[PDB]
Write a protein that binds this ligand. Structure first.
Ligand SMILES: [Cl-]
Ligand SMILES: [Cl-]
Lengths: 150, 152
C-alpha cells in the first residue's frame, strides 16, 4: 500500500515547526484552472516510500483581487520556487499560462526544472526550442514524466 | 559629430562586421505588425540621433511578418535567443495593449544577467507580476522609454 509521507504547503496555509531539510521539496508550477495539482499530490501520496513536501500555489478558493493578497501570492510563489529541490511544471494545451513562462525562464538554467507541455499549447514550439537550447527535460504528459520517478 | 548605428535583423546579415567593437543592444518586447506601433524603429532612430558612440542593435522585428512555415519560425526563435545572449544590454519594452507571453519568458531568462532593463507600460495585464519579480531580483523597471533612454 501507500507508505510515502506527503505534506502539502499552500500560500494560505502554515505548517509551523516542520523541518523542510528532511523532505524532498517539489514546487507544482503551471496552469491554474479554477486541477492536475491535486492529482499530482495524490500520486505522491500513493508512493510506497519517501518524504515529500509539495509547494502547491493553487488555493482551494480563488484570489480576492485585493493587492496585498496578490503580492503575498507572487512572493510565496518566487520564494518556494527558490526553496524547491525540484520544479514540476505542467502546461495544459487550453492555457495561456503567461506567468508560467516567466517562471520557466527564471529557473531554466537551475537544473531543477522539469517541463510537461501538452501539444496544442499556443506557444509549444517556443517552449520546445528554449528547453532544447538550455537542456531542460521536456515531456508531453504527466504519465510519461511521473514514470521517471517510480 | 554623429553616432555609428548598425541594425541587425533575423533576415539580414552584416558579415564584414566585428561585433566586439560595438555596444550590442537587443530590442526585446512587443512586436506589433502595424505601421503605428513600431517602437523598435523609433528606438533605432533615437540612437542614430546621438552625437557619439558605436551601436549594434539587434532588432527581432522583421519588416514582413512570419510566413508560419516551421523552419522560418525556428530560425526566428534561435536568432532571438542567440542575440539575447550576445547583447551587452537588453532593452525590454512592453506595451499595455500586448499579451507579450514570450517577452515574459525572455525576461525570466535574463532576469539575473544584470544586463536587462525593463520598460513596462502601466495597464499591461500582468504589470504587478513584472513589478514584483523585477523588485525581487533587482532589475531596473521604467514606465516609459523616455525615462529609460535619459539614463543612457
Ligand atoms: Cl491561486
Ligand atoms: Cl518578426
Amino acid at each position: 500500500g501507500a507508505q510515502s509521507e506527503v505534506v502539502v504547503l499552500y500560500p494560505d496555509t502554515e505548517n509551523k515547526d516542520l523541518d523542510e531539510a528532511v523532505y524532498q521539496k517539489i514546487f507544482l508550477a503551471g496552469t491554474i484552472d479554477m486541477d492536475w495539482q491535486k492529482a499530482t499530490c495524490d500520486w505522491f501520496r500513493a508512493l510506497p516510500e519517501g518524504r515529500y513536501l509539495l509547494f502547491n500555489p493553487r488555493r482551494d478558493k480563488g484570489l480576492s483581487g485585493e493587492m496585498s493578497d496578490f503580492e503575498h501570492q507572487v512572493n510565496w510563489e518566487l520564494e518556494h520556487l527558490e526553496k524547491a529541490d525540484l520544479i514540476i511544471m505542467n502546461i495544459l494545451a487550453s492555457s495561456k499560462s503567461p506567468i508560467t513562462l516567466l517562471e520557466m525562464g527564471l529557473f531554466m538554467r537551475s537544473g531543477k526544472l522539469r517541463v510537461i507541455c501538452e501539444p496544442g499549447f499556443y506557444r509549444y514550439d517556443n517552449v520546445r526550442l528554449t528547453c532544447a537550447r538550455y537542456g531542460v527535460p521536456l515531456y508531453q504528459n504527466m504519465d510519461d514524466f511521473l514514470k521517471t520517478m517510480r
